[PDB]
Amino acid sequence: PMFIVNTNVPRASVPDGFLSELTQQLAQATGKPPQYIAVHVVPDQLMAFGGSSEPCALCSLHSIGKIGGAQNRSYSKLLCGLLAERLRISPDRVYINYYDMNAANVGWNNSTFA
Amino acid sequence: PMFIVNTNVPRASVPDGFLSELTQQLAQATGKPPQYIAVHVVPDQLMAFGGSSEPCALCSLHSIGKIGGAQNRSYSKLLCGLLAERLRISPDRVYINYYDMNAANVGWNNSTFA
Amino acid sequence: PMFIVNTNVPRASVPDGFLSELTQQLAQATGKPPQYIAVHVVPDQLMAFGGSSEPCALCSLHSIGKIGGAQNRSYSKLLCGLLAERLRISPDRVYINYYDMNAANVGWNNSTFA
Ligand SMILES: O=C(O)c1cc(-c2cn[nH]c2)ccc1Oc1ccccc1
Ligand SMILES: O=C(O)c1cc(-c2cn[nH]c2)ccc1Oc1ccccc1
Structure with missing residues (x-):
């Protein structure tokens, strides 16, 4: 999977090791396979939630593939938990958008998937 | 609702309270509910439109939901206007991609909206 | 189309005129029409690909409209080729997500397309 986090929490508060932990946990x-998992964190952002x-x-x-009702609930729980634990962001101020990409619509290594 | 703006307009040009303004106008x-409205502004970007x-x-x-023909026309007029008045960006150099997310694909507060 | 690059390659490693080349190459x-081609490059990002x-x-x-595997494989090679040559990015560490937007879900110039 590809996972991207944008947040108003500053750079300093992003623990070293956090990208590795997202890769490990997202593979699990x-x-x-973790070799194809990509993770991206953007701290220091001008953003708001509820105006605040x-x-x-x-x-x-x-x-x-592998996106739907039950799976997206378990990923939400895992990643909210991780963002709360590691960046001190409350679960109710996290949004996670899930996308099921069709293989031909994902470029990689001069071509596309399958 | 989630609204994200990326722009080459510098940080200084974004007026104070712009995020709240976007949150009020998007809520209308x-x-x-205002508590679900998230906004994010990214200034200083290395961008071009038409190569310029x-x-x-x-x-x-x-x-x-709440994404379709007329609504999007109206959102575009509202939002391009806000970007013209506040950020001084001509509406003809603005794209706004609209997405109708299914409830099961939007995670929040350790779960999804399903 | 709208092309967006996020990378951990620093600001300085991005050659001058790279946005025009991307615009040139995407048009051809x-x-x-190049006038509607939008490009966005985001250097110095905190990211990992395959744990590394x-x-x-x-x-x-x-x-x-109009997305298919033949075109996407050609765009992938073209775009991967530009990132190798100009940004020193190995093609086996590049994802490109392709999206077929409906005209009505792309806002532009106070309205939407078609
Ligand atoms: O988890 C995935 O399915 C997966 C997803 C992506 C992706 C990148 N942007 N959007 C999607 C890339 C590689 C993947 O992993 C693969 C690993 C081996 C073979 C095929 C895909
Ligand atoms: O190349 C495109 O398909 C195209 C894509 C977009 C777009 C913006 N955000 N997401 C997609 C806008 C205009 C385009 O070009 C057009 C040119 C003429 C008429 C309509 C669209």
């Missing part, structure tokens, strides 16, 4: 959760500048996060999980 | 325009460096913006508005 | 590959933080890119290319 999705049933996907209290810590928040706008996130994105792109996957080729 | 969509009829949605002139002020421009690339935006997106994600929502669970 | 796709046949689309060697130079990488997570990209997107949005078009109105």
